[PDB]
């Protein structure tokens, strides 16, 4: 795989940075992120998928709207549910609402879901390099909040699946002076960090990058 | 310990306490009450674009309240905000999303 990768550079494959606010919807933002990118990569159509759909309906795939969830499961929702609409037709509100899914309005599809084994970082490295941006979760400690630039390393987090707490989109990988990193899309608005983005150290399964990550194969 | 969920319950800390003291005027601007001392008893954290504290505050002989504060992200200039509050809570009522 190349020393570096970056879907943004490759093209109109990554959507604008989104803001998720005070709702625990960060998982839905990984999911919509991946899929959008997949579709674009596969077709050239850059779409902005609705996270409220996932906030209001994923319930069955073990998610819990604003109080949490995982992208793999979100992907399954999109598959079984048979599609997911985009923002303009199901506006993002940040709170728990009751499902307003409308079948003739879904604009994006999930055929299958690629699950990167537990703690297998290089598989993420492969996927992100060869197929798509990978949705992922990791422990976020207070340090992380201040984040502004550079490569976020942590000796505070512990790479265990007992406390990862934030889903994000791996949109690339790369290298800085000698330390390897991940180019990551966050869901806190463009103002935070490097215009919505952050760079975590690669190679140590830092905070659990590789704990429960995935990417989706779009039905296109 | 899912993504976007709430942490396990942890005992309250001096920072949490402070949060409840900075926030107590808000609980009041809304309930129009006048509480005595509100003691931070326990809490839970949730990661949003910022933090959402779920504070179990002991205030009244054996009267507990559950406040929910959203702490902004270091970025812009903003204080703590009382975005919710359950009242008539017990000493054991588990803190939860709301």
């Amino acid at each position: 795989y190349p020393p570096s990768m970056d879907w943004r550079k490759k093209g109109n494959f990554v959507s604008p940075v989104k803001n998720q606010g005070s709702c625990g919807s960060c998982w839905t933002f990984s999911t919509t992120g991946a899929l959008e990118s997949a579709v674009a990569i596969a077709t050239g159509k850059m779409l902005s998928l609705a996270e409220q759909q996932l906030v209001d309906c994923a319930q069955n795939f073990n998610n819990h709207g604003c109080q949490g969830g995982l992208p793999s499961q979100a992907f399954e929702y999109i598959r079984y549910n048979k599609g997911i609409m985009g923002e303009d037709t199901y506006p993002y509100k940040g709170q728990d609402d009751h499902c307003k899914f409308q079948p003739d309005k879904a604009i994006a599809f999930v055929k299958d879901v690629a699950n990167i084994t537990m703690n297998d970082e290089e598989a993420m490295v492969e996927a992100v390099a060869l197929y798509n941006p990978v949705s992922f979760a990791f422990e976020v400690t207070n340090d992380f909040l201040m984040y502004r630039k550079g490569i976020y390393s942590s000796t505070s987090c512990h790479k265990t699946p007992d406390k990862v707490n934030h889903a994000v989109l791996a949109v690339g990988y790369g290298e800085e002076n000698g330390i390897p990193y991940w180019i990551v899309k966050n869901s806190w608005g463009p103002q935070w960090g490097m215009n919505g983005y952050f760079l975590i150290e690669r190679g140590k399964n830092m905070c659990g990058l590789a704990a429960c990550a995935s990417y989706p194969i779009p039905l296109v | 310990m899912i993504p976007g969920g709430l942490s396990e319950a942890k005992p309250a800390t001096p920072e949490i306490q402070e949060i409840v003291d900075k926030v107590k005027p808000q609980l009041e601007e809304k309930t129009n009450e006048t509480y005595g001392k509100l003691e931070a008893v326990q809490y839970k954290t949730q990661v949003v674009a910022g933090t959402n504290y779920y504070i179990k505050v002991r205030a009244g002989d054996n009267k507990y309240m559950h406040l929910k504060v959203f702490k902004s992200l270091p970025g812009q200039n903003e204080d703590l905000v009382l975005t919710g509050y359950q009242v008539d809570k017990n000493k054991d009522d588990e803190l939860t999303g709301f």
Binding site: W27, N62, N63, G68, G69, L70, S72, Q73, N115, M118, A137, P161, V164, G208, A211, C212, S214 | I2, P3
Partner: peptide, 8 residues
């Protein structure tokens, strides 16, 4: 196997 992390 289902992704254990966002489960319980």
């Amino acid at each position: 196997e289902p992704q254990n992390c966002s489960a319980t």
